[PDB]
Design a protein around this nucleic acid. Sequence first.
RNA 1: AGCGUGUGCCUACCCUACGCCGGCAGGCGCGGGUAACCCGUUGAACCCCAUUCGUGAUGGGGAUCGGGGAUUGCAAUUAUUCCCCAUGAACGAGGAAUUCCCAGUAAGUGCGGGUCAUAAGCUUGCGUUGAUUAAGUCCCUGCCCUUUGUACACACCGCCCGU
RNA 2: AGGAGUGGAGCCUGCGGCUUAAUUUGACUCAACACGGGAAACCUCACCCGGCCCGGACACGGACAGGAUUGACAGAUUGAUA
Lengths: 126, 69, 97, 55, 74
Amino acid sequence: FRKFTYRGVDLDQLLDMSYEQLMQLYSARQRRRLNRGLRRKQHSLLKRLRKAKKEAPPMEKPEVVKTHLRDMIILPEMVGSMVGVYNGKTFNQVEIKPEMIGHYLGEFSITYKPVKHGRPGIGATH
Amino acid sequence: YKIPDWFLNRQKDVKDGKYSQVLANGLDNKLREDLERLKKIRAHRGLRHFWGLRVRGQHTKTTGRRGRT
Amino acid sequence: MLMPKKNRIAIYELLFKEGVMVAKKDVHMPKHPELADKNVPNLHVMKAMQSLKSRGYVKEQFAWRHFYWYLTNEGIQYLRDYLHLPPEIVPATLRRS
Amino acid sequence: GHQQLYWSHPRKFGQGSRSCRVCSNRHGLIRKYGLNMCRQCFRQYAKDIGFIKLD
Amino acid sequence: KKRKKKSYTTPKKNKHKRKKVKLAVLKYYKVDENGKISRLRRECPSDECGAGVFMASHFDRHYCGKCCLTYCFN
RNA sequence: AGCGUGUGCCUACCCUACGCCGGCAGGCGCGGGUAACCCGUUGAACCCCAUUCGUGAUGGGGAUCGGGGAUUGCAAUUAUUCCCCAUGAACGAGGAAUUCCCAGUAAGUGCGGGUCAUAAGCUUGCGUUGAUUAAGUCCCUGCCCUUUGUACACACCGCCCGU
RNA sequence: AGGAGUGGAGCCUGCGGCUUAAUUUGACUCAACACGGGAAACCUCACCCGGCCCGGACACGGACAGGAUUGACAGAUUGAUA
């Protein structure tokens, strides 16, 4: 019937243009930091991605990674690599589709441990 | 009929761009189903929307104190 | 860690010329504009300060995020002996005290 | 020597960039008229700078 | 402020130190039945670095200076 | 109109006048100002209306839920920055208990600094409108004084009696 | 005698706790509670998590000139220059 959609633009059409065009012509926001420019020499991160994908099982999603930096969007050939959830030092294995990768914050789970809470009073007043 | 693509609330967004504003909640349902998607994907902003905690910059010091559960 | 001998000689000569050198402990600045061009980082200032503190050949005074050394006669003697400088080297200007 | 680990995030837009010119205090700094003073130090050297309590 | 019980991890971690070198023998081989000099110096076109700088021995690699020159036999 | 701030060597890190780009945050240029030299004659709050609100839950109103925005500067994440587009919680003078108020005072609002890389419900000053009210008292709350009592003097959070 | 805030609606600093990587460092009143000029995006919180160090002067004293490497490039990092 239809085909995959991502903010109005199509999947093969994602893969059509270049990375720079993908970022300049993307939807609102997420481009300004690299519009000003994210510094070069990003080759080591790409090589870590290559190593993780090689270590990843075939016909399977790439394994958890220990990255703390907010991701970006490139051609859909590789966007979808699993990025773990920072709890305090771990990276939870949660199925994050490439539509949520590169968005706000890498913690796709809770950030804090809630405290046990009693009735109003006693534990609410001195 | 000469109304610009800046004065209206269905401009291009996630999934596919929305077009045509129809009567009643013809797109309000469309703009609540994206909220449903946000809750169904288990996102921090989405789960905070589900829990009843406003996200656009709202602090919480007295909200949720009258008629809370 | 490998504190240079050439930088030490330059620093010693600069101190010997007048009697003070631009000393700060801030690390956000790698090299002071006067301290630049000669590979002089913050740690070099720190090491020189502590070595002269233990040596005692100059007396240290700290005031308003700045340091000041009191170049003594023993300091001049040790500086000559360890730098092997000629004996007629001494800050001895008289004009406009 | 600590240059390959520090300077990892430039510090020129926050309260860490401005410090008291006497005690390296980053709390309660006065930046009016380029004073770069903290309240305690400013009142300590208030008469020396030129300000006098008369109003 | 005090010890936070950090002495069980990295049990007195040692400062980085790869090898402890007295003399170089395998890198010096000028025996050609005549005693003449034999070298393998290779340098990048520049002024800061020349033939004086030493070389890391490898089966195919030429570590020269700080420019990170990569020139391999494929 | 008023107080008054503004071109910076630790740093493009200022106020910006004028024309271009757009309903919009913002970018371009020539620059004026190191200042009673420019912003600035500092053109907001207000008083008007021979046309349009009418006792709602709403054009007296805000998470007007979610999407369009972005700053010559580390990434605005329960995102303290942001110009655009209806809905709604709630309130009919706020039963106890009561701050603070002597004339340009209370109140009525806006501006400027400290905040500040953008950031004011805070705070610190400033003009901007002008009051029925008070020329009094110890009723309350305190505090001070005098006389008085004290077995208190660590001074009533004292001392001390008995089981 | 009058002009206003609340047990009358949303927002701003501090307590009974953060069994996560986490406030502990002030007040039982005026004279604590838009106060430490406290509007921490990270930088100021060291506080809380492998938080690069010898960069713990001691010439302590001794073998030895190698006493040693605070550098970046790879299963020498699943955290670009750790």
